[PDB]
Design a binder for this molecule. Structure first.
Ligand SMILES: Nc1ccn([C@H]2C[C@H](O)[C@@H](COP(=O)(O)NP(=O)(O)OP(=O)(O)O)O2)c(=O)n1
Ligand SMILES: [Mg+2]
Ligand SMILES: [Mg+2]
Length: 424
DNA sequence: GGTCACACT
DNA sequence: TAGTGTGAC
């Protein structure tokens, strides 16, 4: 196939944590902004950045003190601290607002706290049926961009260029054909406009979206015209788009695999992948990766949009870097208890909200000087939503790790995760 | 820094 | 694992 079977959208909130704080605090609005956690060290780590702030070069993971140097006026919203650790409840709850709205339109997959994939194939056919032999107006796509267009003097302005590109696309469109993938993408884009308007109107949160035939392309497209804009990436636009597209850009090619792909094949762009036979790619990167790469560089992916509105696992973690590493048994127990308590609060709310219970508890830790995020992973049955029992059980699981009332080596990280959810 | 999902074997 | 490592937000 040409992988034009489905219409898929990825909707991603623009600087989400910042928006949540901005909505709550009007003074932050339309200003260089960032969300930080753990203010005491280096002003705290920046985890979210407003677009005004990004203009000053402020970036995520940048110490607030350093960010201040770039942007003296930068406004900061602090992640809530509960029980001595960052609490992300406000953002999770804000995420639910967005997810619930999106769920109304189509079957959604929660890719992250601030984004979800949508399969609009069914919705599109019905809408196509609803409007018959009906030409699609540009007004229905006020925030839509057509990648690769315009092509072949208002062009000086970005909005003018967007209008020209959109017009070229629409004039080209043949609406008398229901089957056409481009038409389907276009109608899908119309719905996404409606979906995004509903999100903004109902939550006050602005978002961006990518409309394409698969998840990878939808995701890539979404990023192209952020913020507060949606981009339609057609099948035909892929060759030109991928021709200069760094391999790392494609989802899942951001890490080692992307590097090896680049390193082994001596190429920099997605498009260059077309040269190679499927076997060739399979030989270097194996059976699953090779097939995925071969199809993907051709704008073809089959990964389905999973029907998962609600997350699979609920986890609590904290880090005790460097000196702060826990070197006493009582210390480990107290922190396990703090994690367990928050987990219990989240688990209990989850059970009431989602009608399910977690049957398995996962405990993960890191010892100092270990190069691995997890020094050890251990699991024990989770039979009660009791923080004291859970923390007590977790200690039992990891206690042996200690080497000779004091803990050695000191623990750099503690992780608690509830998993294996069951209906209740 | 804190949470995720998932492909391994 | 069951338990580890990858890639993501
Ligand atoms: N390393 C990261 C990346 C994201 N996040 C959190 C904070 C973000 O606001 C939120 C959403 O991630 P994101 O979509 O990658 N970025 P954000 O929404 O902030 O800005 P956009 O670029 O998407 O407009 O998750 C995080 O906590 N740690
Ligand atoms: Mg976002
Ligand atoms: Mg995101």
């Amino acid at each position: 196939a040409t992988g034009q079977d489905r219409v898929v959208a990825l909707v991603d909130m623009d600087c989400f944590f910042v928006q949540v704080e901005q909505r709550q605090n009007p003074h932050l609005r339309n200003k260089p902004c960032a969300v930080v956690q753990y203010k005491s060290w280096k002003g705290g780590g920046i985890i979210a950045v407003s677009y005004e702030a990004r203009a000053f070069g402020v970036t995520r993971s940048m110490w607030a003190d350093d960010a201040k140097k770039l942007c003296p006026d930068l406004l900061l919203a602090q992640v809530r601290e509960s029980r001595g650790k960052a609490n992300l409840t406000k953002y999770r709850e804000a995420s639910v607002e967005v997810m619930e709205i999106m769920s109304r339109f189509a079957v959604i997959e929660r890719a992250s706290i601030d984004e979800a994939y949508v399969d609009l194939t069914s919705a599109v056919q019905e809408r196509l049926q609803k409007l018959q032999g009906q030409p699609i107006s540009a007004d229905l796509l006020p925030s839509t961009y057509i990648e690769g267009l315009p092509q072949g003097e208002e062009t000086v302005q970005k909005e003018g260029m967007r209008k020209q590109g959109l017009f070229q696309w629409l004039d080209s469109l043949q609406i008398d054909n229901l089957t056409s993938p481009d038409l389907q993408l276009t109608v899908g884009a119309v719905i996404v406009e409606e979906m995004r308007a509903a999100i903004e109107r109902e939550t006050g949160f602005q978002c961006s979206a990518g409309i394409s035939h698969n998840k990878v392309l939808a995701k890539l497209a979404c990023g192209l015209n952020k913020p507060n804009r949606q981009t339609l990436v057609s099948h035909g636009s892929v060759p030109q788009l991928f021709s200069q597209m760094p391999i790392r850009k494609i989802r899942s090619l951001g890490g080692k695999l992307g590097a090896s792909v680049i390193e082994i094949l001596g190429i920099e762009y997605m498009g260059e992948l077309t040269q190679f036979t499927e076997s060739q790619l399979q030989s270097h990167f194996g059976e699953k990766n090779g097939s995925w790469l071969y199809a993907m560089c051709r704008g073809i992916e089959h990964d389905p949009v999973k029907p998962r509105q609600l997350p699979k696992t609920i986890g609590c973690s904290k880090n005790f870097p460097g000196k702060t590493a826990l070197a006493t048994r009582e210390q480990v127990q107290w922190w396990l208890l703090q994690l367990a308590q928050e987990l219990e609060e989240r688990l209990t709310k989850d059970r009431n909200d989602n009608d399910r219970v977690a049957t398995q508890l996962v405990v993960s830790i890191r010892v100092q000087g270990d190069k691995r995020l997890s020094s050890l992973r251990r699991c024990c049955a989770l039979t009660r939503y009791d923080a004291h029992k859970m923390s007590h059980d977790a200690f039992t699981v990891i206690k042996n790790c200690n080497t000779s009332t004091e803990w050695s080596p000191p623990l750099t990280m503690l992780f608690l995760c509830a998993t294996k959810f069951s209906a209740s």
